[PDB]
Design a protein around this ligand. Structure first.
Ligand SMILES: [K+]
Ligand SMILES: [K+]
Ligand SMILES: [K+]
Ligand SMILES: [K+]
Ligand SMILES: [K+]
Ligand SMILES: [K+]
Ligand SMILES: [K+]
Ligand SMILES: [K+]
Ligand SMILES: [K+]
Ligand SMILES: [K+]
Ligand SMILES: [K+]
Ligand SMILES: [K+]
Ligand SMILES: [Mg+2]
Ligand SMILES: [Mg+2]
Ligand SMILES: [Mg+2]
Ligand SMILES: [Mg+2]
Ligand SMILES: [Mg+2]
Ligand SMILES: [Mg+2]
Ligand SMILES: [Mg+2]
Ligand SMILES: [Mg+2]
Ligand SMILES: [Mg+2]
Ligand SMILES: [Mg+2]
Ligand SMILES: [Mg+2]
Ligand SMILES: [Mg+2]
Ligand SMILES: [Mg+2]
Ligand SMILES: [Mg+2]
Ligand SMILES: [Mg+2]
Ligand SMILES: [Mg+2]
Ligand SMILES: [Mg+2]
Ligand SMILES: [Mg+2]
Ligand SMILES: [Mg+2]
Ligand SMILES: [Mg+2]
Ligand SMILES: [Mg+2]
Ligand SMILES: [Mg+2]
Ligand code: NA
Ligand code: NA
Ligand code: NA
Ligand code: NA
Lengths: 213, 102, 208, 144, 203
RNA sequence: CCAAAGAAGGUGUUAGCCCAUUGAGCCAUAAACCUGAGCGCCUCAUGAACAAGCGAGUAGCACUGUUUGGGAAUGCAGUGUCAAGUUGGCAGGUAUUUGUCUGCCAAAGUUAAAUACAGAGUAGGAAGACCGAUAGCGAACAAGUAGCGUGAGCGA
RNA sequence: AGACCUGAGUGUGGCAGGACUACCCGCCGAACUUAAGCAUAUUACUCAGCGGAGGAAAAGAAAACAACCGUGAUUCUCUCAGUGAGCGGCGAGCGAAGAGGGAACGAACUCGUUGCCGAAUCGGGUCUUACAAGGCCUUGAGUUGUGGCACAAAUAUCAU
């Protein structure tokens, strides 16, 4: 709040043949008589300095949030929508992709990678791996140095079983009890590639309901 | 100790309100404030006999000696601010006059 | 122009905005999630520290005051000594076994006293009292099997032993009574209302 | 969003929709509701009549809990009854019981036709509501 | 006990004998200093009521304050601004003379902790209050559970922050509920609550 | 080829495997802290069962000033006047005089938490849809420096 | 002579003093501004000024709300409520509280009094591994009262 305004900086008046903008007081310095207190002056105060009262967060209706999540889930099951979103699903056996729950017992990232190759999500994983690169602006000067694509999202019934899958680059992990729309439709684009465990698949009817139930 | 009168169960009336089994008012340590204070009164009587009268009390006693007791009450009310206090002071001065005579 | 708008009463003529020359008077809630996390973490830490005792002390069930809320029930500050005596507990001892005590609260009826006495009875039936010395266990003190099988309540209101506050049950459907088909409820209610509305004037008219 | 505001369309206009003659000055008509009795009187009088003056008594320390008294009508009483109970409800038989103070209401008013007969427990009632519900085969039970 | 007799005797303050005693005492006090250390309180009953004990580490000081209203210290009685803030003589201090005496004693003797004070005498120009002080470095004080609290640092110069009884009186903390809603916990705190602009996150 | 490690720093181009990191663990500790109120000993405490009173220049009240949404006065201050306690006092938001009801018991004191940190510190962290060297702090740099004013100060 | 009352001098043992000051506590306190003028009002019980603490501070255990089927120290949050409260050249403007959902909460204690005791108290020596919440001694201080016990969460305590 004090930025640009921490000077005496009175206006010289109108008798002198200079503009009427406030000028820095004193002498013996290069800054003496320099224009101050203005968005146009060097070292001055910006127009409408930014505040922390700006509305950063938003309220969304609970039913609208649930509708959005339901629509993203419905769109994730259409192979053409998943294809058009960017994912490489040309070799996967079926959409929606449901696998057995034995993957929750994996302890090695190489077992996880073997399972991914077996179910043919390795194409999308390789897509994101090849897509990794350096960001294209000041974001990399901030803490956003690297970017990559999304890749498949593996959904588990509970919090267990992610040990072998946490370190795979390009694979996201999800819990069926807490499904995020920011991950079901990245960028606002519906049609994410989702790999369901069997238990997570069977929980879907009770989690989201039915048109009648 | 009489139990309180039961309510009627309707929103309007003399005993309006939901019907419950009312309990009597339980005794409290503050119930001893209304009890007469014999020892305090005796101490105050000794101190009053020792010290005598204040100017307010002298003026009120002279007002009461002559027939003017309403004027004594007015003077007490002006000096004390309250009509109850004025009446209490006038009654105390009347009792003091009777005690002085007898 | 101005047109047809509401007359504005926004109430922002004081120096609330933090600018140069003004400290401001504002309150932002940017630490809300961090404070929620801190509160939950502190609650879990306190539960771990006071294990196996319930995190929240036992509280009575009371009726909300005004006529707008008197049909609602909630948790009180503490049990009155009358209720503790009826449940067979010393208030000073109950204050040591996790029961809140409130000397101020008066019991003006038997129903609100009986519900709280029942709460106290249930809590004392479910209570497990650890011995001061496990070698010499006194009367009313738990055995080693109970001490080893102890568990912490850690509930938001500390009412797992006694349950939530009880409400009156809804009346079952029934048939209309013969007196109910005939009685004029509005006439009855209006008569009762007017009895109090015009009590003073009726009394004055009767006196004069 | 700033990219949708009129400031972006007026880049290069040099006046931003305020004119060369009149210009955009700081406070050309006062601040706030200034001049509601002079030089804004037409606006105040034609758009907000009744603004100026005094009316009625003064109720010092108004508590709104004592005055709480929501109302419900006879044709709306099916909102407080479950569907299956209204399925079996009929005049001359067992009828559902409605507790208005627990449902959030204090007075029963009685506008329109009552769709389902019942026994309504209410603090207050209208004479028309009482008569209509007694005609329809229901009842009102006073409560507090 | 004897306390009852002393209490009633000091409630009879307008009698002849008490007026004589108070006149002699007012003369004697008038011919003394502004602050005077005493061996024993002039009113032991009042001192013991307010917290004084005949123990080592308790001290009593009689402090004198001039009577009358405040005068605004403006040069030649000249004030600039609205005519509302123009009075020089009719203004009154928002702090009572008992608090002023306690603060003078506490500021003069900074090694003592002021506990309480009581009225003893007043004449046409002066007013006398006896202030109880405690030595925080005395073993008797530091080992007594009932006066131990005053050794802590939060109680340093409590009379200057208005935490004494007279301070509470002129702060309005003698009242509760609808009589002191804007004065609790303090008027500044109530003003902060009522005037701070609140920005909820999602709004 | 590694991954329970893909973590984003360095290194002569864009590095999981060049380096540092990224984890279980391991070792060492003034006091304090925590642990059948950890556990012995000496000493010292200590638990259970064998009638009257209650805070006086106070509270009022008057006048004046001030403060409050508080309005025939919400608090407070000055000065005058000044109680009750054996229709005891106080509050119950229109002044009076009654008499009923309800809640409470002023005029000593202590007290943790939840709360502030709107131009503070100490020791650490996490950051950011922020700024990017005329910007962001006055100050990315031997910056409150060089310099200026009798000085308060001003200040690249 | 002597006392004890009041007051000195000295020795001995301490403490105060300044900094900081964002927040917090006490005082003191404007004006620009707004009212399209201006004096009440507004700004604002705010800036500047003067004191004082702390990691928080202040507040805090009912001379409380209420008017209920009642509630129950304080503090804070959402709400009440920009209010069919109120206040105001009734203009510009201003503007709370109870109830309710919560956070927190082992939350309570101490003195004076009154009864019954009455030096049992406190300092200081000395001793016990100990400037012991211990013993012993001590006129040193205190009877112009220090300490104990009981006062509603109560119904004795004091022996053995
Ligand atoms: K919403
Ligand atoms: K003076
Ligand atoms: K003047
Ligand atoms: K409040
Ligand atoms: K790298
Ligand atoms: K009464
Ligand atoms: K305090
Ligand atoms: K605060
Ligand atoms: K800080
Ligand atoms: K103007
Ligand atoms: K003001
Ligand atoms: K509540
Ligand atoms: Mg700048
Ligand atoms: Mg670029
Ligand atoms: Mg034990
Ligand atoms: Mg335009
Ligand atoms: Mg124009
Ligand atoms: Mg003043
Ligand atoms: Mg308070
Ligand atoms: Mg032990
Ligand atoms: Mg042991
Ligand atoms: Mg007085
Ligand atoms: Mg004002
Ligand atoms: Mg006001
Ligand atoms: Mg009292
Ligand atoms: Mg983050
Ligand atoms: Mg440059
Ligand atoms: Mg720069
Ligand atoms: Mg610069
Ligand atoms: Mg200031
Ligand atoms: Mg804190
Ligand atoms: Mg404190
Ligand atoms: Mg105001
Ligand atoms: Mg004593
Ligand atoms: Na791009
Ligand atoms: Na990791
Ligand atoms: Na200082
Ligand atoms: Na609340």
């Amino acid at each position: 709040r004090l930025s640009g305004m921490n000077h005496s900086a009175h206006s010289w008046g109108t008798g002198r043949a200079v503009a009427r903008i406030p000028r820095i007081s004193g002498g013996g310095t290069s800054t003496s008589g320099a224009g101050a207190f203005g968005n146009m002056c060097r070292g001055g105060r910006m127009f409408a300095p930014t505040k922390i009262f700006r509305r950063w967060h938003r309220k969304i209706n609970l039913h609208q949030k649930r509708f959005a999540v339901v629509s993203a889930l419905a769109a994730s099951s259409v192979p053409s929508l998943v294809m058009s979103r960017g994912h490489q699903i040309g070799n996967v056996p079926e959409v929606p992709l449901v696998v057995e729950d034995s993957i929750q017992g994996y302890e090695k990232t190489k077992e996880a990678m073997a399972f991914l190759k077996a179910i043919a999500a390795i194409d999308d994983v390789n897509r994101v791996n090849d897509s990794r690169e350096i960001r294209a602006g000041r974001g990399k000067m901030r803490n956003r140095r690297y970017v990559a694509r999304r890749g498949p999202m593996l959904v588990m019934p509970n919090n267990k079983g992610t040990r072998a899958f946490r370190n795979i680059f390009g694979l996201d992990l999800a819990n069926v009890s807490a499904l995020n729309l920011l991950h079901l439709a990245p960028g606002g684009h519906v049609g994410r590639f989702v790999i369901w465990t069997q238990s997570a698949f069977e929980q879907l009817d009770k989690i989201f309901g039915t048109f009648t139930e | 100790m009489s139990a309180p009168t039961p309510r009627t169960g309707i929103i309007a009336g003399f005993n309006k309100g939901h019907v419950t089994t009312r309990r009597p008012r339980q005794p409290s340590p503050n119930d001893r404030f209304a009890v007469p204070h014999k020892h305090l009164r005796a101490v105050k009587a000794i101190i009053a006999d020792l010290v005598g009268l204040s100017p307010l009390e002298k003026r009120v006693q002279e007002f009461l000696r002559v027939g003017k007791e309403k004027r004594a009450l007015k003077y007490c009310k002006k000096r004390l601010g309250d009509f109850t206090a004025a009446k209490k002071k006038r009654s105390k001065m009347e009792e003091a006059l009777r005690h002085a005579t007898k | 122009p101005k047109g047809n708008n509401a007359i504005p009463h926004v109430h922002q003529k004081k120096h609330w905005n933090p600018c140069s020359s003004q400290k401001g008077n504002v309150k932002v809630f940017l630490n809300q999630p961090a404070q929620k996390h801190r509160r939950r973490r502190l609650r879990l830490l306190k539960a771990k520290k006071v294990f196996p005792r319930p995190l929240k002390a036992l509280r009575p069930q009371v009726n909300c005051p005004t006529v707008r809320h008197n049909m609602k029930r909630r948790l009180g500050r503490g049990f009155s000594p009358a209720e503790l005596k009826a449940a067979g507990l010393n208030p000073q001892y109950a204050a040591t076994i996790g029961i809140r005590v409130d000397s101020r609260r008066k019991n003006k009826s038997e129903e609100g006293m009986n519900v709280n006495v029942q709460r106290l009875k249930t809590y004392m039936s479910k209570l497990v009292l650890f011995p001061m010395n496990h070698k010499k266990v006194q009367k009313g003190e738990a055995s080693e099997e109970e001490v080893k099988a102890a568990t912490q309540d850690r509930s938001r209101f500390g009412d797992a032993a006694v349950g939530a506050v009880v409400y009156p049950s809804a009346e079952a459907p029934r048939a209309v009574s013969a007196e109910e088909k005939s009685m004029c409820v509005y006439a009855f209610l209006k008569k009762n209302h007017s009895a109090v509305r015009f009590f003073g004037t009726r009394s004055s008219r009767a006196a004069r | 969003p700033t990219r949708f505001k009129k400031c972006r369309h007026q880049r290069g206009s040099t006046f931003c929709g305020y004119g060369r003659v009149g210009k955009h000055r700081k406070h050309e008509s006062g601040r706030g509701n200034a001049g509601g009795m002079h030089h804004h009187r037409i606006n105040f009088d034609k758009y907000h009549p009744g603004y100026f003056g005094k009316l009625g008594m003064d109720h010092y320390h108004r508590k709104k809990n004592p005055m709480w008294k929501p109302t419900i009508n006879l044709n709306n009483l099916s909102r407080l009854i479950a569907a299956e109970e209204a399925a079996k409800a009929a005049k001359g038989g067992t009828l559902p019981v409605v507790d208005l103070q627990s449902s959030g209401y204090a007075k029963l008013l009685g506008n329109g036709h009552i769709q389902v007969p019942c026994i309504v427990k209410a603090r207050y009632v209208s004479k028309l509501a009482d008569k209509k519900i007694r005609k329809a085969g229901g009842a009102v039970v006073l409560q507090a | 006990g004897a306390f009852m007799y002393l209490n009633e005797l000091w409630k009879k303050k307008s009698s002849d004998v008490m007026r004589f005693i108070q006149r002699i005492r007012s003369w004697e006090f008038r011919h003394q200093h502004t602050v005077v250390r005493l061996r024993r309180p002039t009113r032991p009953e009042k001192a013991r009521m307010l917290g004084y004990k005949t123990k080592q580490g308790f001290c009593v000081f009689r402090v004198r304050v001039r009577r009358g209203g405040r005068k605004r210290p403006v040069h030649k009685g000249i004030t600039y601004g609205k005519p509302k803030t123009s009075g020089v003589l009719g203004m009154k201090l928002n702090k009572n003379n008992q608090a002023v005496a306690e603060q003078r004693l506490g500021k003069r003797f900074g090694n003592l902790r002021v506990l309480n004070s009581y009225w003893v005498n007043m004449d046409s120009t002066f007013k006398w209050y006896e202030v109880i002080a405690v030595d925080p470095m005395c073993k008797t004080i530091r080992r007594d559970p009932r006066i131990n609290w005053i050794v802590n640092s939060v109680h340093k110069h409590r009379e200057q922050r208005g935490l004494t009884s007279a301070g509470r009186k002129h702060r309005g903390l003698r009242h509760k509920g609808h009589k002191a809603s804007k004065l609790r916990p303090s008027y500044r705190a109530a003003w902060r609550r009522n005037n701070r602009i609140v920005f909820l996150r999602k709004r």
